[PDB]
Design a protein around this nucleic acid. Sequence first.
RNA 1: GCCCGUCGCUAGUACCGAUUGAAUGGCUUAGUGAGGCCUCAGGAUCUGGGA
RNA 2: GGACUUUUACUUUGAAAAAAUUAGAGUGUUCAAAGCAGGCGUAUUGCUCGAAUAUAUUAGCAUGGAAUAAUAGAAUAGGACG
RNA 3: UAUCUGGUUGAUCCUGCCAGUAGUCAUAUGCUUGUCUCAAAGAUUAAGCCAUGCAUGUCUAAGUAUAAGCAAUUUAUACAGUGAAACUGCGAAUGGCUCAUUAAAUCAGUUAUCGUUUAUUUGAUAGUUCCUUUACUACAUGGUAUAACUGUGGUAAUUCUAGAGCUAAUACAUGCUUAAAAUCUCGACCCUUUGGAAGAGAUGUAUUUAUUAGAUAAAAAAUCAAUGUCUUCGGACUCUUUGAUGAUUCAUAAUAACUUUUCGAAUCGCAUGGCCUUGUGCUGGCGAUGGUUCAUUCAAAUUUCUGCCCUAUCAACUUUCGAUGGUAGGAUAGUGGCCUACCAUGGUUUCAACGGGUAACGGGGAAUAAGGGUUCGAUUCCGGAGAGGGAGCCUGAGAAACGGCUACCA
Lengths: 260, 155, 188, 167, 131
Amino acid sequence: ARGPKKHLKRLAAPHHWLLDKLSGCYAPRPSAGPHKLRESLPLIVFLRNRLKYALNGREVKAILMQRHVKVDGKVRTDTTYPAGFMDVITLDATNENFRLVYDVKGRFAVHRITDEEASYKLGKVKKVQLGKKGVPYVVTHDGRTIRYPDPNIKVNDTVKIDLASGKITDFIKFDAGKLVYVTGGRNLGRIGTIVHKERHDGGFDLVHIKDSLDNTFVTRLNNVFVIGEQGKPYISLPKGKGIKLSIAEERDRRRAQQGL
Amino acid sequence: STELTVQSERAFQKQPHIFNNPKVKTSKRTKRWYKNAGLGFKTPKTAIEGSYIDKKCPFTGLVSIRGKILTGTVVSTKMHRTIVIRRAYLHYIPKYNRYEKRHKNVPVHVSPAFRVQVGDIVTVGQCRPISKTVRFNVVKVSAAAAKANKQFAKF
Amino acid sequence: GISRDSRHKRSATGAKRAQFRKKRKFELGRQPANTKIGAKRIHSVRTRGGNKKYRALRIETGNFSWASEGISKKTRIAGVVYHPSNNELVRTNTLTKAAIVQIDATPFRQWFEAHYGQTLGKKSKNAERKWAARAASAKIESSVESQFSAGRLYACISSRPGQSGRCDGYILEGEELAFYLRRLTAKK
Amino acid sequence: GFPMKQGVLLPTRIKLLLTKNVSCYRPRRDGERKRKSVRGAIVGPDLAVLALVIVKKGEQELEGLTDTTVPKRLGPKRANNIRKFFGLSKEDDVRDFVIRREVTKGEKTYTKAPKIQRLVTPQRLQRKRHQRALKVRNAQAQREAAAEYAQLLAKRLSERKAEKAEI
Amino acid sequence: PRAPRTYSKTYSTPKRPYESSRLDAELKLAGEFGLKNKKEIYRISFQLSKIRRAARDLLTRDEKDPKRLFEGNALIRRLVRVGVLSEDKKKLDYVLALKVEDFLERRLQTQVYKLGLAKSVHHARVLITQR
RNA sequence: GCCCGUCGCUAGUACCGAUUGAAUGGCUUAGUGAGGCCUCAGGAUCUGGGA
RNA sequence: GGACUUUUACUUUGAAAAAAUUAGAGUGUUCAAAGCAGGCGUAUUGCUCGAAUAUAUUAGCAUGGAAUAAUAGAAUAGGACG
RNA sequence: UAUCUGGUUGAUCCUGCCAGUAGUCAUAUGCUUGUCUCAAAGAUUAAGCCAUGCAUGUCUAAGUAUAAGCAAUUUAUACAGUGAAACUGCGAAUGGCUCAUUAAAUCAGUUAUCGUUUAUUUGAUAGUUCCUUUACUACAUGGUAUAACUGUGGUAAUUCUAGAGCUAAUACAUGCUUAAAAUCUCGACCCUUUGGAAGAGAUGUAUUUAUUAGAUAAAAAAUCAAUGUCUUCGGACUCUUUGAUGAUUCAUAAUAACUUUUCGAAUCGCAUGGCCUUGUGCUGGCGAUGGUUCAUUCAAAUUUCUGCCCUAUCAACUUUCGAUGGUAGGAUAGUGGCCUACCAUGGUUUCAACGGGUAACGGGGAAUAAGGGUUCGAUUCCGGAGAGGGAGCCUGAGAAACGGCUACCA
Ligand SMILES: [Mg+2]
Ligand SMILES: [Mg+2]
Ligand SMILES: [Mg+2]
Ligand SMILES: [Mg+2]
Ligand SMILES: [Mg+2]
Ligand SMILES: [Mg+2]
Ligand SMILES: [Mg+2]
Ligand SMILES: [Mg+2]
Ligand SMILES: [Mg+2]
Ligand SMILES: [Mg+2]
Ligand SMILES: [Mg+2]
Ligand SMILES: [Mg+2]
Ligand SMILES: [Mg+2]
Ligand SMILES: [Mg+2]
Ligand SMILES: [Mg+2]
Ligand SMILES: [Mg+2]
Ligand SMILES: [Mg+2]
Ligand SMILES: [Mg+2]
Ligand SMILES: [Mg+2]
Ligand SMILES: [Mg+2]
Ligand SMILES: [Mg+2]
Ligand SMILES: [Mg+2]
Ligand SMILES: [Mg+2]
Ligand SMILES: [Mg+2]
Ligand SMILES: [Mg+2]
Ligand SMILES: [Mg+2]
Ligand SMILES: [Mg+2]
Ligand SMILES: [Mg+2]
Ligand SMILES: [Mg+2]
Ligand SMILES: [Mg+2]
Ligand SMILES: [Mg+2]
Ligand SMILES: [Mg+2]
Ligand SMILES: [Mg+2]
Ligand SMILES: [Mg+2]
Ligand SMILES: [Mg+2]
């Protein structure tokens, strides 16, 4: 219908935002950017709804316009800037670094990270073509163009990225038995090594995952984000380490912790 | 369907950008191009041995098979270079807890690398809009004729 | 204006479809360039999203290439002489792709003789080297050599003049030339 | 009160489609044309007013016209235009040839000259200096990272021939 | 364009409008707990009704089924919590039994009377509604 | 005892029916055909073949 | 990587899967319909649990099963293996 | 949350309907009406008609200020604060409303783009622009023609505007530039060989065409035509370079040319410093706005499989004037009968085609509670469609737009 849509009705907004039903009628529509709409956390939601640092939306603009807040290094002054998985939100005041990395319920958790882990990010390479003048390039789930990468690097591999400068300092091949973060589906936020991948020529390679609790499950290869080695990840994982416990399991953990 | 003539049109039939240099004396006249459509569909030898042109051929032409792969039994071969198959199936009506016979006819392009007749079961592959109605291309005959030569004369 | 929807047009059953919605501009079609010969006259046309298309109406020169010699020259376009789609294109000398034309030869002459040192139909140092280097290669082809006497070469337009403002093509050669030669006279 | 329109001919009115950049019409919106009445360009007795320009001054003076002379409101503001409304050669320096309009604040008589544009200035050359400098600087860097990749492949090849000599 | 503010009703009417026996049995409840409406009884018998449905539904799944154990325990503990369900018969075939007066016995109305402090179900009302 | 139909009253409904009856809405032949768009020309004026 | 494969129905588990609605957990909106809150202290400079789960079927996908019901095969041998 | 009761008889048992009974996010109306919270609401009939007001405008240090504007102070004799008007840029294609049309359409779930367009956001990305190439081309920066304004006017009347006179740019229109090198074709001369050469041009990107590379399914040889690098002068060639996909004529590159030639910064804000042969030389900081190509993101457009209410008192339908396919073109953003030519005779149907009806927008959903079902969904979210009716189109990345224009009808 006639052109780009500019609004987002509350209720149409993604759920893992934990937006609330009333108090309005719209939600912030994520700017065009590095991450898809429906898999992002816009700056307004994070500064206000998570960190509680502003109350008003109007205050969130006042905060950003001082250039306090910088994503992946750069300063970012877009109330609805589409922040998303693997990024690094930083508050110059309050000396505070974060990474956007998933819960186990499938939500973006607040996750405080070190001042120096904050100087690089991970990126799944999504494609690698041969660009203009013979110069080969890789492109990462967060839309970064990196020229002259390792030949050995190909699609579905993850890649450590300088932030400080553009470049790739390391990569991890997609091999049977590599630490995997699950970015999508119901199994979103789970973490678990890899068993083996169903091929299926024509569409939708499946990837069989097993975590550190010898529980198993499957997703589409598309939904698989390599992040390291058995034991050894390459970023600090948020508490609970994406293991996913039964409702009964979680009930008990929560009603075992009680002796005030 | 095609058969005979090959150069039978007002325009000259040729595979595009497949130059044969008249200067260079060759023993085959026409240099031919082909591919394997993929998904494990044997590009039959009649498409390589052939001389027909059909740009809408999955092995010799500039179509591409991607998407749905379907089977059905041939019910109409009256159209030049395209057939019509019937895909039958049973459709489940919950209230009665029973199914009824239904069917659909899908029209599909058939390259003169195949020789199809009515009753042949045929595996077709989805391709780009190739005509007003045809969105599929015959990609393998899982048939033969249904024992025709076992209908010859007397002893 | 011209629509390219399928939503007119009976369904494959033959059924008559109601009108749902009006003409959108993204299914639009525009009119034919119907380009002719002579004195450069092209009109840009603003097509979806910026993107110019060039509508040639009247062209006199195009860039034509002799494939087997791997060169390309810019010649006059003499005339249209055969067209598989519609004869009115031939009779009104209309340029479109597929059209069979005649061009000039004298640029493809001036190249040949200056490169082979042989001349069609009927003293420098390095030249003699290069000329003698070539040949056993200068053999051309009868049905193409003949045309030079006439000073006009048969060629098949390969560009889309109504689209790109270019009227380009290749010389006719060997197999495909024989095809039109037969059609030419066995219709003449 | 409908206006004439040069080149309609006719000594009557008509209704035309008018566009941007055309007399008797000021478009209210991007790519808008309004269909408006217009009077012809041929003088008839219906005209309330005939617009006229003097081209040769006859043998006598017309009071409020030849006898009075009204000054041109604005003066030259672009660099070379001052240079041409005085004829100066790119040597003479404009800044003192810009025009100066006095005015009073009751007991403060002021002075306000334009703002010469397309003036060549030190600032501007620093930006020209900078552009070129960046262009070339990049250019070399881009060769480097290129040649760096040649190496990354050259001693990768001689690792597939140190591998192809192990077995 | 807003979120539908959701509601639902909290009572249910009797099928048969004039059943002399249900009628007596109903008033007697009011007389005993100081209600003003048959609705106040309708309200509860409806609550009761669904609880039983929840309990029935759960009871048809196999013993030690995950939902059953989770949703079963949850139901029971909540009932205990307000003191409707007996500590002993804490296993939901008595939530299946149960009955209206077990619910009535826990209204503030009724507690504010039970340990004196009102000495009448009605004086109990008046005191409560009067801050 | 029951009870059937013509015939007679009041009231209501639907049918048939001269009027080649009427009205609304959807398509649509043939004829006439606005307007913009494209196109062959045009050239008030206004510059360096173009506007 | 090559070289080839009788067709299906049924059923199992699973992916891919909007939110509000519904079913349903946790939380004493004073109750409740609701809401997704809230709860703790050093109440002078913070501590912390949450924001589940289920259903989501007909079709398409992916996998296990081989009963039930179809289909095809070798009889003018133009059969099968080498 | 698995219940029935009244009514045919003299009485009886049945069949069977009418009546009762209960719910309705289901409307109306009547009577009655005190408190907290919650809060639907001109859908239904008339997508009937509308007085008046309002609902789209927008400025940062950072495109344009001689307001004959305000401010004055505080350094500014080109400008500098602030700033109406106006130009320029961006937006007005979102939103909100409504449910008329629409029955294989929409819509849902599920696919496809190896079938395309994509402002913007984000990330990459540009040493090549001139010219027979020593008496040279503005680069220390090339052209005017306009608003606002000033003044003269016209009409009963409008967001009507005319004649005159000015003047800006990130508006309009132009137009210079930069290393080394390598490879190509020409080739003045010299000499016979097996043969080699000064030096002359050409080569950014984009456009259009033609040609070529883009290997790999396990291994080897001979000969023709051209012709590479290394001589231990019969000869050898030894290491020999390769991206992605299920799949491509893919990504990318190479050759010959083509172009009323796309882009390659004549822009702006803050700082003002290094550096000597003391030229105001040569350099040089932070970041704005631009800019081609690619990627990304917001999109769009088409698209595969299956699924719709009643109807035979609709059985055959489709090709007048495309109906179903083939070839070629044209047109499009692009596939495609989309359109045109030529050619063919196809396409659908009792497994219900085609036609008719719908007091029909589809979906999420809603009401009724043993289960199976029945009925409803104009209407808070998603999709679609419209703006009194039809058609046309301008602008633009995006409209076949209606709080845009043009025409006809009312
Ligand atoms: Mg926004
Ligand atoms: Mg795919
Ligand atoms: Mg046919
Ligand atoms: Mg025309
Ligand atoms: Mg300037
Ligand atoms: Mg299932
Ligand atoms: Mg939920
Ligand atoms: Mg009676
Ligand atoms: Mg009786
Ligand atoms: Mg009696
Ligand atoms: Mg009843
Ligand atoms: Mg209405
Ligand atoms: Mg309404
Ligand atoms: Mg001023
Ligand atoms: Mg809208
Ligand atoms: Mg001018
Ligand atoms: Mg410009
Ligand atoms: Mg080879
Ligand atoms: Mg390869
Ligand atoms: Mg290509
Ligand atoms: Mg200085
Ligand atoms: Mg009827
Ligand atoms: Mg065709
Ligand atoms: Mg026929
Ligand atoms: Mg029927
Ligand atoms: Mg309707
Ligand atoms: Mg609806
Ligand atoms: Mg309905
Ligand atoms: Mg309605
Ligand atoms: Mg519309
Ligand atoms: Mg109206
Ligand atoms: Mg009409
Ligand atoms: Mg309109
Ligand atoms: Mg309005
Ligand atoms: Mg509007």
